[PDB]
Design a binder for this molecule. Structure first.
Ligand SMILES: Nc1nc(=O)[nH]cc1C(=O)O
Length: 196
DNA sequence: CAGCTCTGTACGTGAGCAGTGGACAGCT
DNA sequence: AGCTGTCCACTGCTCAGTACAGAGCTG
């Protein structure tokens, strides 16, 4: 239990997406966790490396945490959303129907606000997104920039390893910070190419 | 065969938890 | 000195997606 709050109570709770227009980066999660639903703020968890990697990459340029998430769209042009709106404990707890339902809702949100870069935050959520939305399932899928824009917009797709600490292949935030940096370079490159 | 999909299985760090015990001040 | 308590340093845990092998497909 979290400070006396049952897990069943957290499952009923939802984590509201923080979204505006003209955003440089929208961070797409898998689906909000217990700690995330509890705090009412994105990427609380003690481990998750999100806020650590955000600082180490120089994106935030100051060390922040989940409570500053609402100030991100204004200052840093960074938004938040999820593949699945439902509050879930882990990824293995999600079915295929839920992912694809969330896939439709996600792409509709993405083609609504239309940011510069739509950043997936996992391996798996883009695998399903690419198969569902683009109808393209590629063997040996890779991280980083993707060949396909979301339909009828200019928004690029960028894939990163999940900021969750459950991932053994990327044990430390030092391992995942590499993609955050390249994301920053992509953002600066889109701004410079636009002003040209 | 060859390739593709599906299921299950195993894998590292470092933050936080409860339990443990040593340090140690306040007593008499 | 002897006893008893709090406090905290420290312990041993457990816990927050991804790659891949192999069974079961289909061409
Ligand atoms: N973006 C996320 N949000 C969550 O609530 N859990 C996990 C992720 C993730 O793996 O990116």
């Amino acid at each position: 239990s979290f400070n006396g709050v049952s897990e069943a109570e957290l499952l009923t709770k939802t984590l509201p997406d923080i979204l505006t227009f003209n955003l440089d980066i929208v961070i797409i999660g898998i689906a909000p966790g217990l700690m995330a639903a509890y705090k009412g703020h994105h990427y609380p968890g003690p481990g998750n490396h999100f806020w650590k990697c955000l600082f180490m990459s120089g994106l935030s340029e100051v060390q922040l945490n989940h409570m500053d998430d609402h100030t991100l769209p204004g200052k840093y042009g960074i938004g938040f959303t999820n593949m699945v709106e439902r509050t879930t404990p882990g990824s293995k707890d999600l079915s295929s129907k839920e992912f694809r339902e969330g896939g439709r809702i996600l792409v509709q949100k993405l083609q609504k606000y239309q940011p510069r870069i739509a950043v997936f935050n996992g391996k798996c959520i883009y695998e399903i997104f690419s198969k569902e939305v683009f109808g393209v399932k590629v063997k040996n899928l890779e991280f980083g920039l993707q060949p396909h824009k979301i339909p009828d917009t200019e928004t690029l797709c960028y894939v990163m390893p999940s900021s969750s600490a459950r991932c053994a292949q990327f044990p430390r935030a030092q391992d995942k910070v590499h993609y955050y940096i390249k994301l920053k370079d992509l953002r600066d490159q889109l701004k410079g190419i636009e002003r040209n």
